[PDB]
From a paper:
MHC, also known as HLA in humans, plays a crucial role in orchestrating the immune system recognition and response to viral pathogens. Similar to HLA-A*0101, which is one of the earliest identified HLA alleles among the human population, HLA-A*2601 possesses a similar characteristic for the binding peptide and acts as a prevalent allomorph in HLA-I. In this study, we found that, compared with HLA-A*0101, HLA-A*2601 individuals exhibit distinctive features for the T cell responses to SARS-CoV-2 and influenza virus after infection and/or vaccination. Furthermore, we determined the crystal structures of the HLA-A*2601 complexed to four peptides derived from SARS-CoV-2 and human papillomavirus, with one structure of HLA-A*0101 for comparison. The overall structure of HLA-A*2601 displays the common characteristics of classic HLA-I molecules, with the extracellular region of the H chain folding into three domains.
To fully understand the specific features of peptide presentation by HLA-A*2601, we determined the four crystal structures of HLA-A*2601 complexed to SARS-CoV-2 T cell epitope peptides EVF and CVA and two peptides from HPV: DVM and YVA. CVA stimulated both HLA-A*2601and HLA-A*0101, but there was no significant difference between two HLA allomorphs. In the structure of HLA-A*2601/CVA, the P7-Val side chain of the peptide points toward the pocket C, whereas side chains of P6-Ser and P8-Leu orient upward, away from the PBG. Meanwhile, for DVM, the side chain of P6-Ile inserts into the pocket C, and the side chains of P5-Tyr and P7-His arch upward, forming the “switchable” bulged conformation due to different position of secondary anchor residue inserted. This is due to the fact that the pocket C is shallow due to Tyr9, His70, Thr73, Asp74, Arg97, and Gln114 with long and large side chains in the PBG, and Trp156 contributes to the volume of pocket C. For CVA, the side chain of P7-Val can insert into the pocket C. As in HLA-A*2601/YVA with P1-Tyr and HLA-A*2601/CVA with P1-Cys, due to the absence of negative charges, Arg62 and Arg163 of HLA-A*2601 are not drawn toward the P1 site. As a result of repulsion between Arg62 and Arg163, Arg62 rotates upward, moving away from the PBG, causing the “open” conformation of pocket A. In the structures of HLA-A*2601 complexed to EVF, CVA, and YVA, the PΩ position is occupied by Tyr, forming hydrogen bonds with residues Asn77, Tyr84, and Lys146 in the HLA. For CVA, it can be presented by not only HLA-A*0101 and HLA-A*2601 but also HLA-A*2902 (48) and HLA-B*1501 (49). The epitope can be cross-presented by multiple HLA allomorphs, which can serve as targets for the design of universal vaccines.
Residue numbers in the entry:
A (entry chain B): 1 to 99
B (entry chain C): 1 to 9
C (entry chain A): 1 to 274
The structure:
């Protein structure tokens, strides 16, 4: 069977405007390991994105951290975009400063 | 240190 | 507390494109320290934690040599399994493996293990005595008979009860300052209105290590588990972890609700109230 990814978008440090931070997109609980993840600044794909090394949990499901450095402001909104074999259309999750 | 032994099914 | 060393292998066939892709990572507790990716240009076991770079080139030569052998054996293993199951060649398939060892808090051997999965379900596992196996289906019992005819377990047992524990104790000393630390959670509460009758209470634990932690709500003392969300613990990206738990509350009752936080780094458990 295949398992669909859980997604969380959040910052490494608590968001303070104008202070340098990191934006994170953590996908986990998915199977199989092929997955495509993009970070979006105002709908346009951030270009320098890094990702951690593929590993998995005790129930064999996979997880991955995607992250780019950023400096947040009042106007700039952000999001993570994820496509997986188990997803009909790419799912988008927006960075809410309070989750 | 990874193992030296191989695991073949 | 206890400590662990663990290696995780994932091989994934890609018919029609290249050879299968192999990815190995190694962990001590919740800290990654090595990686290997058969698709990368380097073709070396590479370091991923500060305290492992202090190992000489013999270290990286053996580990690289050994990890590459394991990848080749798993490209073979993928082919054998698609025979035992009579699967077509158009389909992508996965082999995952986890092995390693635990020591107790005095440093002594506690447990070794090795488990294998195919397409995300148990395939065969080494038993806690390190001398027999458990198989999940018919195909895996062919492997269980193979490994009993030879004497594989004794080899497995030598590594798990030997080099594994020994190198885990060495790693625990070299990165004393990374690996034996505990960072207690930094905690606070937030407040958001759902409307006029209800509002959200959110309890945060930030920048903690190791990852194990317990956030529980109590309205008046009963472990409130209704209207409470509880997100999967997640990594911050700098070695620490994060978690929150929310609870919907009716306007005016906030003072009933407390949040309770336990973690290994806390002198006592923590209580938070709005």
């Amino acid at each position: 069977i295949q398992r669909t990814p859980k997604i969380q978008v959040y910052s490494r440090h608590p968001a303070e405007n104008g202070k340098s931070n990191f934006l994170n997109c953590y996908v986990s609980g998915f199977h199989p390991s092929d997955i495509e993840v993009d970070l979006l600044k105002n709908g346009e794909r951030i270009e320098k994105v890094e990702h951690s090394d593929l590993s998995f949990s005790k129930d064999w499901s996979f997880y991955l951290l995607y992250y780019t450095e950023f400096t947040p402001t009042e106007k700039d909104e952000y999001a993570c975009r994820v496509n997986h074999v188990t997803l009909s259309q790419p799912k988008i999750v927006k960075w809410d400063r309070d989750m | 240190c990874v193992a030296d032994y191989s695991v073949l099914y | 507390g206890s400590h662990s060393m663990r290696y995780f292998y994932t091989s994934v066939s890609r018919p029609g494109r290249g050879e299968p892709r192999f990815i190995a990572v190694g962990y001590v507790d919740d800290t990654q320290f090595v990686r290997f990716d058969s698709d990368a240009a380097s073709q070396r076991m590479e370091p991923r934690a500060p305290w492992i770079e202090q190992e000489g080139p013999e270290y990286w030569d053996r580990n690289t040599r050994n990890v590459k052998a394991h990848s080749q054996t798993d490209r073979a293993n993928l082919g054998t399994l698609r025979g035992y199951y009579n699967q077509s060649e158009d389909g992508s398939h996965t082999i995952q493996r986890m092995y390693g060892c635990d020591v107790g808090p005095d440093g002594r051997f506690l447990r070794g293990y090795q488990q294998d999965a195919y397409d995300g379900k148990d395939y065969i596992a080494l038993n806690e005595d390190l001398r027999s196996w458990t198989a999940a289906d018919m195909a895996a019992q062919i492997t269980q008979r193979k490994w009993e005819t030879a004497h594989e377990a004794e080899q497995w047992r030598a590594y798990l009860e030997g080099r594994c524990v020994e190198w885990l104790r060495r790693y625990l000393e070299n990165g004393k300052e990374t690996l034996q630390r505990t960072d207690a959670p930094k905690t606070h509460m937030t407040h958001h209105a759902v409307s006029d009758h209800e509002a959200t209470l959110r309890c945060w634990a930030l920048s903690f290590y190791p990852a194990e932690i317990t956030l529980t709500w109590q309205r008046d003392g009963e472990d409130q588990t209704q209207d409470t969300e509880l997100v999967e613990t997640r990594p911050a990206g700098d070695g620490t972890f994060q978690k929150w738990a929310s609870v919907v509350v009716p306007s005016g009752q906030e003072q009933r609700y407390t949040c309770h936080v336990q973690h290994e780094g806390l002198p006592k458990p923590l209580t938070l109230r709005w």
